[PDB]
């Protein structure tokens, strides 16, 4: 407990104490280049997509949008989008990696259309954070 | 303070806090202590900036 440190009862923590649901929402929208050219939300095709992020797309569905209940950590790709390029590797990856530190269970995914008409996706991942040594109290 | 009378150089108006922390502080005493503490925090940060310029 020295220098303002503290000691917390592991038995009292095992019973849910100071336990925080942490929700993180990641958003990506279809980006319109104009002239009938649009970014596409789909699971990327490796030959079609160049410089894709080094993460698993297996969790990602066909649509390029992950589904609730999937467990994602590290480099797992939560949102999959491809960018047409002005002919091999025509698409370029716009997929959104999960942040490296998070482990998560996908709470929900919201797909809608904005005022201009582009498709919006918001993926909320849910983690439970338990008191761990060094957390500020 | 608006509660104190005009031209009061008496110790309570001038901010001397008779009461201890245990006893409790009257509202005027607390505001005066807050003035002092604010000066302290200001002093802390800005004077660290000055001292670091000196050190460099």
């Amino acid at each position: 407990n020295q220098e303002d440190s503290m000691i917390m009862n592991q038995s009292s923590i095992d019973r849910g104490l100071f336990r925080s649901l942490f929700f993180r929402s990641y958003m990506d929208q279809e980006k319109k280049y104009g002239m009938s050219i649009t970014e596409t939300f789909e699971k990327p095709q490796r030959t079609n997509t160049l410089r894709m992020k080094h993460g698993t797309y297996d969790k990602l569905d066909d649509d390029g949008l992950i589904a609730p209940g999937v467990r994602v950590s590290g480099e797992d790709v939560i949102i999959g989008k491809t960018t047409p390029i002005s002919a091999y590797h025509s698409k370029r990856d716009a997929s959104t990696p999960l942040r490296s530190t998070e482990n998560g269970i996908v709470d929900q995914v919201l797909v809608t259309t904005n005022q201009d008409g582009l498709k919006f996706v918001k993926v909320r991942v849910r983690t439970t954070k338990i008191p761990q040594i060094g957390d500020k109290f | 303070l608006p509660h104190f009378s005009k031209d009061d150089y008496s110790p309570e108006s001038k901010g001397f806090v008779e009461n201890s922390y245990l006893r409790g502080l009257t509202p005027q005493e607390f505001f005066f202590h807050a003035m002092g503490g604010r000066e302290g925090l200001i002093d802390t940060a800005v004077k660290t900036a000055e001292t670091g310029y000196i050190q460099r």
Partner: protein, 118 residues
């Protein structure tokens, strides 16, 4: 030093000395009007001024809540209500001499024992 102007135009009088009878009289530039000088003081400079020790003393000052009310009492009308204030003049060197003003009879009684000048 009371300052005077010619009556007709109110522009400021200028001092003038007549040598033959050795007399001082003030003449306006705008109008040739000249008048004898009642007091023979062209100018006064106070390095130290007690003036402003009592500033804006009104009957209504007695009403103001901020100003404190003293225990002591004025000898003149023997009023008990009186309002006491520190000197209005704000100086590098100031005397912490309380000036007490009567609520009734408008008597101002300085706390200081040394000086009784108005």
């Amino acid at each position: 030093t009371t300052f005077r102007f010619c009556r007709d135009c109110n522009n400021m009088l200028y001092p003038r000395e007549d040598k033959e009878n050795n007399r001082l009289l003030f003449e306006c530039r705008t109008c040739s009007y000249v008048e004898e000088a009642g007091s023979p003081l062209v100018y006064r400079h106070e390095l130290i001024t007690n003036i402003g020790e009592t500033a804006g003393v009104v009957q209504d000052i007695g009403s103001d809540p901020t100003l404190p009310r003293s225990d002591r009492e004025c000898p003149k009308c023997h009023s008990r209500e009186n309002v006491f204030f520190q000197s209005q003049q704000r100086r590098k060197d100031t005397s912490m001499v309380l000036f007490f003003v009567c609520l009734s009879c408008s008597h101002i009684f300085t706390s200081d024992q040394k000086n009784k000048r108005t």
